Design an enzyme around this catalytic site. Structure first.
Site, mmCIF file in Angstrom:
data_model
loop_
_atom_site.group_PDB
_atom_site.id
_atom_site.type_symbol
_atom_site.label_atom_id
_atom_site.label_comp_id
_atom_site.label_asym_id
_atom_site.label_seq_id
_atom_site.Cartn_x
_atom_site.Cartn_y
_atom_site.Cartn_z
ATOM 1 N N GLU A 106 -2.005 56.016 44.986
ATOM 2 C CA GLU A 106 -3.351 56.064 45.601
ATOM 3 C C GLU A 106 -3.246 55.430 47.010
ATOM 4 O O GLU A 106 -3.580 56.015 48.059
ATOM 5 C CB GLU A 106 -4.347 55.388 44.682
ATOM 6 C CG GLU A 106 -4.479 56.092 43.297
ATOM 7 C CD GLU A 106 -5.912 56.126 42.807
ATOM 8 O OE1 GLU A 106 -6.344 55.008 42.375
ATOM 9 O OE2 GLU A 106 -6.647 57.114 42.953
ATOM 10 N N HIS A 119 -2.185 49.877 38.109
ATOM 11 C CA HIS A 119 -3.383 49.053 38.365
ATOM 12 C C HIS A 119 -3.608 48.105 37.180
ATOM 13 O O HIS A 119 -3.699 48.606 36.003
ATOM 14 C CB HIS A 119 -4.666 49.919 38.574
ATOM 15 C CG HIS A 119 -4.671 50.728 39.815
ATOM 16 N ND1 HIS A 119 -5.502 51.747 40.173
ATOM 17 C CD2 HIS A 119 -3.833 50.550 40.920
ATOM 18 C CE1 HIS A 119 -5.258 52.210 41.380
ATOM 19 N NE2 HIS A 119 -4.179 51.514 41.818
HETATM 20 C C1 LIG Z 1 -14.887 49.128 35.459
HETATM 21 C C2 LIG Z 1 -13.610 49.667 35.971
HETATM 22 O O1 LIG Z 1 -12.633 48.961 35.792
HETATM 23 N N1 LIG Z 1 -13.549 50.750 36.499
HETATM 24 C C3 LIG Z 1 -12.554 51.509 37.051
HETATM 25 S S1 LIG Z 1 -11.159 50.568 37.331
HETATM 26 C C4 LIG Z 1 -10.780 51.705 38.531
HETATM 27 S S2 LIG Z 1 -9.425 51.437 39.663
HETATM 28 N N2 LIG Z 1 -8.609 52.767 39.679
HETATM 29 O O2 LIG Z 1 -8.663 50.408 39.018
HETATM 30 O O3 LIG Z 1 -9.971 51.264 40.952
HETATM 31 N N3 LIG Z 1 -11.619 52.662 38.719
HETATM 32 N N4 LIG Z 1 -12.657 52.568 37.806
HETATM 33 C C5 LIG Z 1 -13.689 53.607 37.737
HETATM 34 ZN ZN LIG Z 2 -6.762 52.819 38.943
#
Ligand SMILES: CC(=O)/N=c1\sc(S(N)(=O)=O)nn1C
Ligand SMILES: [Zn+2]
Length: 260
Positions: A106, A119
């Protein structure tokens, strides 16, 4: 607004704004890290991760990706140091990949896209009473991103790859226990940090990003395994999870700080 967004042409990243106007925000993630523009912040402390493996709970297919969830009722597994004054509680780890093994991360560094990205997400339990609450606040979450570069196979991934057998289709889940996610982090924890957001809907601007300077390896066959998971529910026609990465977003005057 009850749900339906994806990574395809129709409901993909370039369309998300028709549904979530914040997609065009001022603090969107991911971003390109221009190493010649970062700023050394001497107030930054080393990051300190202290995770309890007995906190690992389950693995689930969510259609667009898979998540490895942890019990977050306590402070048994926390993230400290870096730019923070309070402790952040661990709740989950997941990955992002692309349709090709070369380009799927990303975040980018100096205009260069890595193969994949890990992540490790945490929420501010010192300030909010639940993840649901924290999720929409500016200081709500902290995510550690670790860039993945295709080459030699990473044996530290095996336990995760093995569990994929049981959650082949959307909505499947399985117990996933006794695992410490710090085993996946690089040996040095020098990092970059910047204020941003969730990289997929709802896209809230509630994340303080920690990007490790050092990358980790993965082979093309391990990546192929991510790409073999299905987005459909059991019984329907096969539709593989081909990619789940968003393009980088305008920095709009933010500052990328470096711990070194
Ligand atoms: C509440 C939560 O952790 N949401 C997530 S974590 C995430 S990220 N890819 O880690 O930015 N994206 N989303 C939608
Ligand atoms: Zn993520």
């Amino acid at each position: 607004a009850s749900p339906d967004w994806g990574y395809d042409d129709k409901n993909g990243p370039e369309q998300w704004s028709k549904l979530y106007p914040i997609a065009n925000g001022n603090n969107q993630s991911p971003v390109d890290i221009k190493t010649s523009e970062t700023k050394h912040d001497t107030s930054l402390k080393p990051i300190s991760v202290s995770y309890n493996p007995a906190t690992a709970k389950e693995i689930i297919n969510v259609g667009h990706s898979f998540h490895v969830n942890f019990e977050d009722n306590d402070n048994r597994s926390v993230l400290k140091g870096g730019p923070f004054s309070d402790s952040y509680r661990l709740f989950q780890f997941h990955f992002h990949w692309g349709s090709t093994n070369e380009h799927g991360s990303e975040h980018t560094v100096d205009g260069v896209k890595y193969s994949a990205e890990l992540h490790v997400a945490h929420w501010n339990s010192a300030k909010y009473s639940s993840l649901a609450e924290a999720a929409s606040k500016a200081d709500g979450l902290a995510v550690i991103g670790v860039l993945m570069k295709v080459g030699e196979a990473n044996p530290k991934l095996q336990k995760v790859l093995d569990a994929l057998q049981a959650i082949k289709t959307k909505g499947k889940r399985a117990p996933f226990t006794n695992f410490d996610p710090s085993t996946l982090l690089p040996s040095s924890l020098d990092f970059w940090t910047y204020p941003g957001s969730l990289t997929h809907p709802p896209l809230y601007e509630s994340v303080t990003w920690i990007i490790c300077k050092e990358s980790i390896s993965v082979s093309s066959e391990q990546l192929a395994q991510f790409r073999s998971l299905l987005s459909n529910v059991e019984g329907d026609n096969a539709v593989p999870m081909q990619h789940n990465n968003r393009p980088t977003q305008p920095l709009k005057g933010r500052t990328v700080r470096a711990s070194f």
